[PDB]
Structure formats: C-alpha cells, structure tokens
Design a protein around this ligand. Structure first.
Ligand code: SF4
Ligand code: SF4
Ligand code: SF4
Ligand code: ZN
Lengths: 127, 376, 181, 125, 71, 71, 109, 158, 99, 185
C-alpha cells in the first residue's frame, strides 16, 4: 500500500521509517512488526504496519504483540502465541464502540440488549 | 472600573491599566476532599493526596505517610527512606520544570515548554516503571513504599541526571540573560520578608525575599540530614530571583538524586510489622497469620492511636502540611490540608498592586497556583 | 525611594569603572548578543533530530506494573479465578466495584454479579493487589475509549472476556511482577 | 566598616544601630517598670533587655555586638525591640496580670515516642 | 516464612539469605556535573563594532560608486 | 444452571462450571494434598490442604480440582 | 555549525537529549536477565517471632494529666527565674554568596 | 436516489468528512488533573499538531470541547455557557473519570457526576489520568466518528 | 463588615431594622436582575420579606438573631449576584407510602 | 522537638488564659478561651523570644458530643527560633469568636474557609463571604451531621436553558462498610 501515502502522510512517515528496518514478525491479522536498532532513538525502534491502510486502528494490535510493541517485554508475539492458554479464551476483537448497536457492549438492563433482565429482587404473587 | 476574567476567576479594579486590587474566586475546583477523607480509610485516602497538588504528586504522599507514621510510630527502613527521597526530588524537578515552562509560556516564550516536557516524559516514564501510572502513582505508603525498584532504574536515572544537567544549562542559557525575560520578571511582584511572613508564604515564595529558611534543613524528615545539598535564597524577592531560585533548586535536586542513587542501601521497602504494612503475596498465600493480616488490612485499616498532629514537608510549591486528628478508629476523624497555594493566592492581592495585567499573569505564574491544592 | 536612587547611583558607578567596560556593555545591549545566541540555539534544535512518537504505528514505552483496564482472569483449567471474597469493593477507594454472589450448583463459591464502573474507577490497582487469588488484574490495555457511558459501565461478562482476550500478556506481566513481590 | 546589605529585602541597614538599640532598650526598661513585679513577663523582659543593653554598651562595633550576642542582624534586634515596645504598650492597655482565683489549668504530658524520620524541628546548636 | 520464600540450596542459618535488588554498580556511578557551564566564546564587543563601522564605510563608498555608474 | 444463566447470557460458549466438571479428578497417593492453583505457588491461590478419607472426590474449594486418593 | 561559536553547544562537556535505543534501556522491565530477591523481614525476626516487644503502635506510655491550681501556679511563679543562658536559642542563618563551581568543582553532585 | 447521484453525494460527503477530520480545532477545558496530561499530549512526543489538532483559546473558533478534569457545581454553569458559544458543528471529549461519571469524587457535594449532565458528550476517555497515548486514541476515535457523517446525503434525502 | 454579637434585645432589633432597610433599598436591583415585572408586585415582595421577619419572632437568643441576620445578608448578596377536596392525608396516600 | 519557646511561653505568658497545655511529640498544644485568643496570639507574635510571626493555618474540628462542638485550631510557626506551636479554642454554632486578621493578614482566607465549612463566625473580619462552596450554598459541609453527598445536585434544564439545582436523587447510594473490630479498644 503505497498510493495511500499521498493522502495519508502518516503511512508516508511509516514507509520512510521502514528503510533500514528488519521485519521481526507478522501476526495472523496481517500486521507486520518491525524493529530497527543502531543509530535510532529509544522511542522509535519498534513499530507496526497494520496492513489495513484505509482504516488502520490503534486497537488492532493483538495482546500477543501488545507488550512487545509497547516495550513491556522482549518477547515477540510468536512466543506469547505459543504460550496462549487452552480450554478457554477468545479471539482478539478491535474497539468498535460505534460501529453498531449489535457490535457494541450492552448492559443486562439496557433496552438495546438482545435479552433485557428485570431487577427487583422479589417475586410477586403472580396469580 | 471592575474587569472580570473567567479554572481561574479573577476580578481586577483598574484605573489607568494599573491594577489597584485583584480578588480571586477559587471555589471552582472544590471537591469535598476533606469530607471524603473523613469518610474513607487511610489507605483509601492516600489517592486523595495523590490528586492534591497534582503537579507534585509524591510530595503529598510523603507528607501524608509522615503524618500517619507520626501518629502511628512505625519505623521505615533505610532503603524505603532513600527511594522516597529520590522520588520526592524527582517530583520536585517535575514541578519546577512545569512551573517554569508554564510561566515562560504565559510571558510569551513558547519553545522551552516542549523541551521540559520531553524531560518530564522521561521522569513520568520513571514513575510508570517504578509504580502503576505516570501520574497519581500511589507508590508512597505509611511505613514504606508499595513495591521495590525495578532493575535498571538506577542506571536510567543516572543517564537522565547527566542529560538533565545539560538540559538545565540549556534552558538557563535561553531564558536567563534575555533582555525581554529580564524586563518581564525583575521588579515585578516584589515581597518583603516581613510581608511573606505575615501572609504565610513558604518555599521559593518565602526564600525569594531571603528569609534563609528551608524545611528540609530546619526539620529534616528523611536522610536529608545526610545529603549536604544547597538551599538558594534571593537577595531581593521578585519574579526573577524566584525563577533563579527554582533553577538552583532543580540543580540541587539533581545533586540529591545522585547522592541517593550512590548511597542507596540494600534491604526491605516497608515497615517490618504486618499489623501496619501488608504482607507480600507469597507470604499471604503461604502463611495463615499473613493471610489473616492481609485480609484485615485490606478490609479494615491500621487503627492509629487517638491523637492530633500537624506534619509538614517541603513540597516543591512550598510547605505542604497535613493536620490529622484521629479517634482510635480505622478512619481519620479530621484531615486539614494546608497547601502552599492558598497563602500565595492571598498574596496575589498585594503582590499585583499598582502593576498591570501582564504583571498579574506573571505573578500568578511565579506563585505557581495549582487550583486542586488550593481547593482541597 | 531615596535609598533606591542612591543604590542605583552606586550600581551605575560600580558597573562603569572604565571606558572599555561601558563600551562593551553598550555594544552588547545594542547588537542583541543574547538574542543572537538564543537564535543560534533555536537553529540548532531546528536542525537536530525530533522526538515525535508517530502515534498509531509507534507507541510509548510501558511497564508490566501498568494500571490500564480492569479485567478478570481464569484458572488454567477454565474455572473462574474469582472467589466471592468481596475484597475488591472493601478496598476500592472510589467504590467503583459492586459484587453479589451465591452458592453455585456444585457448592462452589462464585460471584453471580460483578460490575465495575470505568467512569468511577480511579485506576489505582488496590483491587489487583488485594486479590488473594490474583483474579482481578488491571490489564495492560488502555485504548478502550467508548462513545457511551453505558458502554463504559462494565460487568462480569465483559471483564471475563477481557481477561480471556488479554490472558497471555496479563500472565507475562503477572509473572514479571510476582518476581517483584 | 558598613554593612552592604542585610540579606533580608524588607530590612534595611541602619548606620546608628548601636544608638538606636541603646535608646530602644532604655525605653523598654522605662516602660516595663510599669508592669507588676510578680509577673514572670516583667522579670524575663528586664533580664534580656538589661543583658542586651549591657553588651551593646560594652561593645562598640555592630559586628562585635552581633558576635557577642549570638543573635546577629542588629536590624532584626531593632525590629524585636520595637515589637517589644508594642507588646508592652498592649499589656498596659489591657490588664492580664494576676490569677483569677479558683483557677485550674490542665497540664498534659504524654511520652509517646515518634520515629526518627518524621519532621521534627531539631534544636539549634 | 521468610526462610521458605528465600531458601538457598546450601544455607544452614537464616542469615546469608540470597538478596538481589536495584542498586549502584560496584564503583558507585559517575559524577553528573550539577553545575552549569556556559562558555562565552563569541566575538568581542570592540571587534563587532569595528566590523560594523568598516562595513558601513565601505558600503557607503560602494553606494557612491554605484550611484555614479547609474548617473 | 440458574447461577450461570444469572451472571452470563452468552449461552454459546462453555461456562466455567462445565470446564471444571470436564477436567478429570487428580489421583494422588497420599492421604492429604496441597492445592495451590497452578505450577507456580506464588501465582495461584492460598494453599489448601484437602482430606481424602471420603470415597467421593473432594473439591479444592479453590480452583476446584477433585483430588482422589489412589487406593 | 553556527551554534558552536558560543553557548552550551560550544561546551565540550555537552550531552545530547535523545537517548539511543542501544544504550538507554537495554532490558525491558518484564524480561530482566537476572531474577530479583527482595527481603521482607530481618533475619532475626524469622524464627524468633515475638510481637509484644516490637509492637511500636501500642507500646506507648499512658497520657499524664495534672490539674494545677492557684497555689501551684504561684509556687511555680515564685520559684522560677530567668537567666541569660536559659533563653531559647535562636535559629540563625545567613547568605554566603558562594560560587556555583565551589562545591566539588561543579562535578561531584 | 439514483446510483450516480448517490456516488457523487458519497464523494462530496467523503470530502467534507476528510476536511472536518483533518482540521479539528479542539478547545481545552482544563480543570483538575487531567489538564497536565493533556499538555503532555500536546507536547513533542505525542504531538497533536500533526493530525490537525491545535488548541483555540476562543470558543467561537473551536470545533470540539475537550473537558478534562473535575466538574464542580460552581463551574458547571461556566462550562455550559462556554459550550453554548461554540459553532453548530461541535463535539465533546470527556477526558478522565471526573468528567465521565464523577470519578474519585462521585459521592461528594459540589461535584457534577460527569459532564454528560451539563453538555452532550460524544466520546469518553477512560483513565485517571488517561495516558496521553489514550487521549490521542480518543481524538483519533473522534476523527473516526466524524468520518461517517453523511450530512450531504441526509440533506439531499429530506 | 461583621460586628460583635449584640448584647441587648434593643441592639438586635436595631440590627434587624438595618437589615430590613438594606433589603428594601436592594429590592429594585433585583427587579433588573430577575425581570419578572409581570407578577412581581414589589409591594408584595416587601410584604413577603416582612412576613419572613415576622415568622422569625419565636427566636429570642441575640446570638441566634445575629446569625440569622448574617445569613440573611449573605442571601441578599447572593440574590444581588444572581444566584437562584380529599384532605391532605389521602393525596399523600395516593402518592407514596413515605409521607 | 524544640520545646524551648513553648516552655518559655508557659513561664512568661500570663496564666489567666492558659486553660490547658499539652507537651507532646506530635506538637505542643495550647488550649485557651475564645475571649483571650487574640491577646494570646498578639503576645506570641510580638514577644522577642517567642516570635511566631507566621500563621501556618487555621482549622476546624467538629465534635457533636460536646456542648461546644466546634474546635478552632491555629497552627503557628517560629522561623527565628524554628519551632511549631498550636493554639486552639472551642466555639459553638452561634457564638462569634475574635478574628486575628489584624495580626496575621493571611488569616482572612482561612477564617473564611472555617466559616464556609463549619459556621464559626468571626468578630472583626473585613469580610466573611463564602470562599469554597457553590454560590448560594445553604449548609456547612464539614459538619459531621452534614451528609457526604449533600442535599442538592445540579443538571442542565433544557426548557430553562440554564443549569438548575435540584434535590439529590443519586443512583448507586453510598455504601458505608462497617469495618470496625470489636477488639480494637
Ligand atoms: S484499580 Fe482502584 S479504583 Fe479501579 S476498581 Fe481497582 S480498587 Fe477500584
Ligand atoms: S479480590 Fe479477587 S477473589 Fe476477591 S472478589 Fe475481587 S477478584 Fe474476586
Ligand atoms: S479523572 Fe483522575 S486524573 Fe483526571 S482530573 Fe479526575 S482525579 Fe485527576
Ligand atoms: Zn485449589
């Protein structure tokens, strides 16, 4: 995705920064994670290309690569995928929060919930 | 005529652009902090002190913990004392940087703001590595600290101290000696030592006149009596001398940080007794008594003996004091919060007398009024 | 003001000792030496490298002991890690946690209702350190801005799914910090 | 010599500091003569005022009187003397002397220890 | 128990328990130059004044020559 | 059942009760066990000692795992 | 470069603001090459637990109260006297006007 | 209503949304202790000027109000008065916990339980304080929210 | 300016009269402050103020009288600064249980 | 520490107004009558060997059990002799106590704050308007009997086009947890 650079200018900065970088990994969502040591300042030696140039979001980074990208861990996302728990767990989902009422989270008492639960803590006689 | 400005509300009486008098209205950030502290346990009330005087976070934690330990009589280990001093001086550096750069922006100088924010981002990274969050980190607790320092923090702080000596030289070169800066600062809002004592000034605003009195030397509440630092005083109290005092305080804070890094000991991070300090996770998961004490300390609190005390520390703004009155229960009966912005904002009235509007904003910047602590 | 006048005269006499000094001072005040020096420093920083983070692709450094989004974990077997000890809201300074519970079908003590207000949580980590079983943890996630307050009002199912989603990173941070405990 | 500056911005150096102090102390003694003798305030005032008057009479140089007194800043001493005059005038204006009879005062003394790391104002050397 | 938590493979007494915390490296770090060093290596006041005066004089001479050519 | 439906409404994934019933009982030789939650005692729950004289499996009451005596 | 003529840049002991990624923060906090060991108690107070001696919170003397009457007040007033050495000491301090490079040459910190 | 007029309308709406997204001019409402973190967001590291965010001190020229800090009963009328002066295309970002639901002073006199009771807020930024990273995430979320404004289509189909 | 506590009922009465004078003189300012000219009836407002003073006669402590006057002057300053047949039992019964 | 000028005061101060004294490591304490507080502070501020010339602060404590519920505390400091002192009195709701604005000019805002929080009025204050709470606040928030959440709350009323104040109707009532142990005494 290089034509998006002209109207994006931020992907342009990313592509400029991927000149001397080394592709340290890639996730199952397509995000390509790059590292670049040497003559680089501390804060800009690890980054991601989201592989979704049109509508890339900051919440698309999976938890497996979140720590490595945020400099919490030296462990890449592959090791955390290997260590992913079994018998339970859900796939990573972005922070939609506005893409639809059927997508966003609703409380059990909210009218938009598919199943709304009453809250009275007593059972009437119910003739 | 009366001119109104509207969280800083201020009404000024003007005659010829000359400020006859200035009256601030402050309650715009009142939040019932004292009432909530009375309604909550001591540990639950520590975040309130985190929020008070938010530019200087851990100074208020230090004051509150010192008051609680005074009312409680618990010995804090040397390592905990040294890390508390280190982070208090980091807090002082942060507050001085923010005060100086906001004052410079109010004057008109815009560029040092972002350099000092790069330095502040480094220091907030230090905070976030040592504790939970960059700001309002509930790290200092009665009896010690929350957790031990992560490894490498000392080396990173040393690197920061060197680069920050360079940065302070840099900022002083740009601001100090500028003709515009001098014309903005000198002979603006001068305070005599008698006036400062009458109006209850503290910290830089009190040492600016030259009273030659500092809390860290008058009542050393830490290893401060082993750190042989310097305390600058102003020859003729005004905005320029207060700014120079703040620069010198940043330098001496770096000095104290280096000394603490050099002579930090190896030991524990909190009070030895589990009746007052929570046990570790392994201890509470392995030991029956430790589980009991963790449960009791996290449902109830430590019951301080019924007494009333006033504990004051040298916060970067000035003397920050907490007046704690207890009744033997797990909650503080009364907690009065003397912030070194409440008195300075009173001093605004006579400081910005016969001055102009730009002198008023310069005086506000010099006093460095954070409205959270004045609306405590 | 007579004292001020005589002090000014004394200072003027002091800093006008000789023609060399007065000429140097006049030239310095006339040719804007300090202004030129400030301009030179400004140009140096114009030509030096920048520290901008390039937000969406490059993100600021964090720590394993980061207080981000409240979340609930599970045991490796799959059962809820949270017993209903109610130490969360006993210590929560902002009272942002509400919990109700009853005995489960197999006699286990489990919470039948567990909600946290993210508009009332002060993100202080008191619950995550008061948990006897490491059930509630303040996860590393912090980019969960919502368009609605009702969305920001969490509950047990959302906390559990957050824990399941962020289980691996939360586990890594928990190991690293249980070392520091 | 002459003091270039007193450090305190509010205070200003006075050339005739010794003469001003002598006059203020003499007036202090003359005014405190009106206070009842039984009161401890009068005894303390006479004590320190006589001591200061004696030392400032014996020593001529202000540096010498400062060094011998140990308080320093003859300007601060003059301010203290003026405040003492004001206080004596106030205690003549209102009469606080004498116990009111059938009087009780509750002296409270607790020896509860405090840790060495709390802020306690250390005594001057 | 502290001994149980910090047990050593071959320790006999509760003392000499293993310990490793953040601290100085052997040597105690390096000095950090708390003071300020501002060198004034710029041109002297007399030098810049002479340069300005000579520049003004030679420039006025050049102005005269150019005006003569234009005339 | 009722409790699970009361705190959860997804009714599509497996509830923790079903998973913990599906994990088999743990056979142990001794009469008493030490239940810690996982391989790391510091990352599990407070230690729980369980008596195994009754023939039926005994729930740990923490991370309930149903330890059963061998013979 | 024009900025080395004068100012902080001309100083040989000048430090750049930007820290290199290869020298600032070598090991991420969650992955440290060495395992920590933080003490939580003195070695003495491990197998010798005894809290009634180190109970610093409750081991305090009781508060003492004394009701002084007029006779006692007069007795103390007559007994007491003031001397030149019994007056409170003054906490005196003064400026020195000392150079910035005077303490350790400006390096030691 | 057609398929070519619909395409033209979609292009016009895309251009309008691009302009409004790239030229956001928020105004700080900086009370309490989210304003310091906001200034950190506006600093060199997480710079806001790149995305078009510049802080306009005058409410008449501002686009969206970012309320960061605690809302007090003494200050809520001022907040509402300042909000009412903003132009009709307007948005609100409630930063922190105090401005969302009262935060750490929810059970307190003279504290508004979130700015939602005074002004209609569009996006909440949870945190206390939210990291500058998170606040810039919230601003990008505002850009995404105003990236789906079919104003021209709605005007056409009335 | 705040004054010491009144030591006499006559002094308290004089202070009450002074406060009522202040209210009466400050009444026309409230007219332009609030703008309810349709049904204000300035005379009715004066009557209501007098009725409040007359319903506060059961107090006899001069300290309480002075405190009430202080709070009334505070309220006056606030208002100047513009800061705002089925029997009774059956209606409450039909409304709610808590009455 | 530094109990020098405290003992010197008790030696030199007139005994008429010293109702009680406390010698503590938490702070030396003087408790007097409200009639003589101004004179006592004038003596301390002006005397040459007890120069507490800076007023740290003025605080209020509520004691519903006592006849005079309010306790007005004055924390003062002596920088010349480097020691802190405490002088307190007892006042009730109606009685007015003397003001020390003339002695310490900083006392004005703390006295206004005490008025705001408790209701203790002062005799010689140049002004005594509320400082911290909302305009038109009715109660005194720091009194023990005052509810934590207050009596009224504000919201935006669209028909009125203004922020109106209405009686509190808050959801998620404050949950008071009784953690007190019966063996703490
Ligand atoms: S992090 Fe603090 S405020 Fe948030 S839920 Fe936990 S205890 Fe409550
Ligand atoms: S402290 Fe842990 S086990 Fe207890 S209620 Fe909270 S999450 Fe559950
Ligand atoms: S939400 Fe937290 S950080 Fe923000 S203003 Fe409130 S207390 Fe401060
Ligand atoms: Zn178990």
């Amino acid at each position: 995705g290089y034509l998006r650079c002209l109207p994006d200018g931020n992907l342009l900065q990313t592509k400029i920064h991927n000149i001397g970088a080394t592709l340290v990994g890639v996730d199952k969502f397509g995000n390509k994670y790059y590292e670049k040591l040497g003559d680089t300042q501390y804060g800009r030696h690890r980054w991601v290309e989201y592989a979704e140039k049109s509508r890339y979001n900051a919440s698309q980074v999976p938890p497996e690569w979140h720590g490595w990208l945020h400099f919490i861990t030296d462990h890449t996302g592959d090791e955390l995928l290997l260590l992913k728990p079994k018998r339970y767990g859900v796939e990573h989902k972005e922070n939609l929060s506005g893409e639809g009422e059927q997508y966003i989270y609703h409380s059990k008492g909210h009218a938009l919930n598919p199943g709304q639960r009453d809250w009275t803590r007593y059972q009437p006689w119910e003739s | 005529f009366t001119l109104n400005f509207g969280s800083l509300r201020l009404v000024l009486e003007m005659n010829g652009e000359v400020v006859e008098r200035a009256e601030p209205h402050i309650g715009l950030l009142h939040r019932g902090t004292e009432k909530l502290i009375e309604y909550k346990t001591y540990l639950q009330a520590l975040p309130y002190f985190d929020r008070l005087d938010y530019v200087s976070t851990m100074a208020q934690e230090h004051a509150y913990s010192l008051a609680v330990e005074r009312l409680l009589n618990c010995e804090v280990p040397l390592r905990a004392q040294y890390i508390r001093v280190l982070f208090c001086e980091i807090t002082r550096i942060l507050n001085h940087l923010l005060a100086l750069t906001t004052h410079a922006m109010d004057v008109g100088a815009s560029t040092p703001f972002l350099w000092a924010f790069e330095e502040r981002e480094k220091l907030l990274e230090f905070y976030e590595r040592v504790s939970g969050a960059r700001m309002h980190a509930s790290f200092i607790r009665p009896g010690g600290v929350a957790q031990d320092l992560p490894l490498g923090l000392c080396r990173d702080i040393d690197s920061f101290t060197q680069q920050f000596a360079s940065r302070i030289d840099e900022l002083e070169e740009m601001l100090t000696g500028n003709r515009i800066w001098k014309q903005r600062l000198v002979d603006i809002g001068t305070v005599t030592a008698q006036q400062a004592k009458d109006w209850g000034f503290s910290g830089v605003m009190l040492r600016g006149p030259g009273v030659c009195w500092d809390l860290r030397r008058a009542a050393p509440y830490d290893v401060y009596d082993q750190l042989d630092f310097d305390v600058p005083v102003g020859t003729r109290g005004d905005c320029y001398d207060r700014y120079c005092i703040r620069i010198e305080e940043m330098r001496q804070s770096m000095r104290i940080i280096w000394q603490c890094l050099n002579k930090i000991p190896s030991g524990m991070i909190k009070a030895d007794d589990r009746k007052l300090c929570p046990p570790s996770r392994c201890r509470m998961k392995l030991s029956m008594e430790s589980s009991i004490h963790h449960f009791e300390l996290y449902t109830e609190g430590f019951s301080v003996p019924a007494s009333s005390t006033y504990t004051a520390v040298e916060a970067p703004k000035g003397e920050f004091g907490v007046f704690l009155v207890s009744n033997g229960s797990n909650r503080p009966y009364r907690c009065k919060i003397r912030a070194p912005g409440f008195a300075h904002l009173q001093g605004l009235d006579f400081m910005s007398k016969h001055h102009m509007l730009a002198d008023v904003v310069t005086i506000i910047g010099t006093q460095d009024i954070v409205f959270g602590e004045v609306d405590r | 003001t007579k004292l001020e006048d005589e002090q000014r005269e004394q200072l003027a006499k002091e800093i006008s000792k000789d023609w060399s000094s007065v000429f140097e001072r006049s030239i310095n005040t006339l040719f804007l030496t300090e202004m030129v020096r400030g301009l030179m420093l400004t140009l140096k920083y114009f030509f030096e490298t920048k520290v901008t983070i390039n937000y969406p692709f490059e993100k600021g450094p964090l720590s394993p002991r980061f207080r981000g989004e409240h979340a609930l974990r599970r045991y490796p077997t799959g059962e809820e890690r949270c017993i209903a000890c109610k130490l969360c809201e006993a210590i929560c300074p902002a009272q942002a946690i509400t919990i109700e519970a009853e005995e489960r079908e197999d006699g286990s003590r489990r919470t039948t209702r567990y909600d946290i207000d993210m508009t009332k949580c002060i993100y202080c980590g008191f619950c995550q350190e008061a948990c006897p079983v490491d059930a509630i943890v303040e996860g590393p996630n912090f980019e969960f801005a919502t368009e609605t307050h009702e969305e920001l009002l969490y509950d047990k199912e959302k906390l559990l799914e957050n824990g399941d989603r962020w289980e691996t990173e939360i586990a890594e941070n928990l190991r690293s910090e249980s070392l520091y405990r | 010599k002459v003091k270039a500056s007193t450090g305190i911005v509010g205070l200003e150096v006075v050339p005739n500091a010794r003469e001003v102090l002598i006059g203020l102390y003499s007036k202090t003694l003359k005014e405190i003569q009106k206070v009842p003798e039984d009161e401890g305030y009068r005894k303390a005032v006479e004590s320190f005022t006589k001591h200061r008057l004696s030392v400032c009479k014996e020593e001529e140089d202000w540096e010498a009187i400062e060094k011998r007194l140990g308080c320093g800043q003859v300007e601060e001493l003059i301010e203290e003397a003026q405040d003492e005059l004001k206080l004596i005038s106030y205690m003549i204006e209102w009469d606080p002397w004498g116990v009111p009879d059938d009087y009780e005062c509750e002296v409270i003394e607790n020896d509860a220890p405090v840790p060495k790391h709390v802020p306690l104002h250390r005594p001057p050397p | 128990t502290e001994a149980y938590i910090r047990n050593k493979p071959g320790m006999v007494s509760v003392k000499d328990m293993p310990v490793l915390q953040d601290g100085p490296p052997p040597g105690g770090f390096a000095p950090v130059r708390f003071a300020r060093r501002i060198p004034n290596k710029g041109p002297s006041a007399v030098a810049i004044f002479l340069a300005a005066f000579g520049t003004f004089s030679w420039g006025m001479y050049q102005v005269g020559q150019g005006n003569k050519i234009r005339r | 059942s009722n409790h699970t439906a009361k705190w959860m409404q997804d009714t599509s994934k497996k509830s923790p009760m079903e998973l913990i019933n599906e994990v088999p009982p743990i056979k142990v030789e001794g009469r008493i066990v030490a239940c810690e939650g996982d391989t790391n005692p510091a990352l599990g729950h407070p230690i729980e000692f369980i008596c195994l004289d009754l023939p039926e499996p005994a729930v740990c009451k923490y991370c309930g795992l149903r330890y059963v005596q061998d013979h | 470069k024009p900025w080395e003529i004068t100012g902080p840049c001309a100083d040989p002991e000048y430090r750049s603001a930007v820290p290199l990624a290869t020298e600032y923060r070598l090991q991420c906090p969650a992955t440290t090459k060495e395992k920590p060991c933080i003490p939580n108690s003195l070695p003495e107070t491990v197998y010798d637990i005894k809290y009634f001696s180190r109970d610093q919170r409750r081991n305090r003397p009781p508060i003492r109260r004394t009701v002084l009457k007029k006779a006692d007040v007069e007795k103390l007033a007559k007994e007491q006297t003031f001397a030149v050495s019994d007056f409170p000491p003054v906490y005196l301090n003064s400026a020195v006007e000392e150079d910035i490079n005077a303490i350790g040459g400006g390096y030691q910190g | 209503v057609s398929k070519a007029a619909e395409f033209v309308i979609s292009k016009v709406d895309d251009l309008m949304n691009w302009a409004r997204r790239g030229s956001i001019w928020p105004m700080t409402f900086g009370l309490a202790c989210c304003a310091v973190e906001m200034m950190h967001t506006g600093a060199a590291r997480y710079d806001l000027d790149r995305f078009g965010i510049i802080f306009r001190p005058s409410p008449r020229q501002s686009d969206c109000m970012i309320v960061a800090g605690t809302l007090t009963n003494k200050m809520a009328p001022a907040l509402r008065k300042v909000y009412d002066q903003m132009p009709e295309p307007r948005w609100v970002i409630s930063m922190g916990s105090c401005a969302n639901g009262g935060g750490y002073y929810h059970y307190s006199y003279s504290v508004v339980r979130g700015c939602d009771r005074i002004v209609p807020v569009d996006i909440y930024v949870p945190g206390c304080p939210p990291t500058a990273e998170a606040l810039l995430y919230g601003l990008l979320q505002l850009q995404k929210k105003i990236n789906r404004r079919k104003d021209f289509l709605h005007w056409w189909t009335k | 300016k705040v004054l010491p506590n009144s030591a006499s009922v006559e002094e308290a009465r004089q202070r009450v009269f002074d406060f009522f004078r202040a209210t009466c003189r400050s009444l026309p300012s409230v007219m332009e402050i609030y703008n309810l000219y349709d049904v204000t009836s300035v005379a009715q407002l004066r009557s209501t103020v007098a009725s409040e003073i007359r319903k506060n006669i059961g107090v006899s402590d001069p300290k309480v009288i002075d405190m009430l006057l202080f709070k009334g002057m505070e309220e006056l300053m606030n208002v100047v600064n513009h800061s705002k047949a089925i029997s009774p039992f059956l209606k409450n019964f039909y409304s709610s249980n808590y009455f | 520490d530094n109990q020098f000028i405290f003992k010197y005061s008790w030696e030199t101060l007139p005994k008429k107004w010293v109702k009680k004294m406390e010698r503590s490591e938490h702070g030396n304490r003087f408790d007097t009558k409200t009639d003589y507080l101004f004179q006592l502070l004038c003596f301390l501020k002006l005397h040459t060997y007890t120069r507490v010339q800076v007023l740290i602060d003025i605080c209020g404590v509520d004691y519903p059990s006592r006849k005079r519920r309010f306790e007005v505390v004055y924390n003062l400091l002596s920088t010349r002799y480097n020691s802190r002192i405490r002088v307190q009195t007892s006042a009730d709701e109606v009685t007015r106590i003397s003001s020390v604005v003339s002695l310490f000019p900083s006392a004005g805002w703390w006295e206004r704050e005490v008025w705001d929080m408790f209701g203790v009025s002062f005799i010689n204050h140049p002004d005594l308007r509320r400082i911290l709470t909302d305009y038109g606040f009715e109660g005194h928030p720091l009194r023990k009997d005052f509810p934590l959440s207050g009596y009224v709350e504000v919201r935006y009323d669209d028909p009125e086009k203004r922020v109106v104040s209405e009686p509190i109707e808050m959801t998620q009532e404050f949950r008071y947890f009784d953690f007190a142990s019966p063996w703490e005494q």
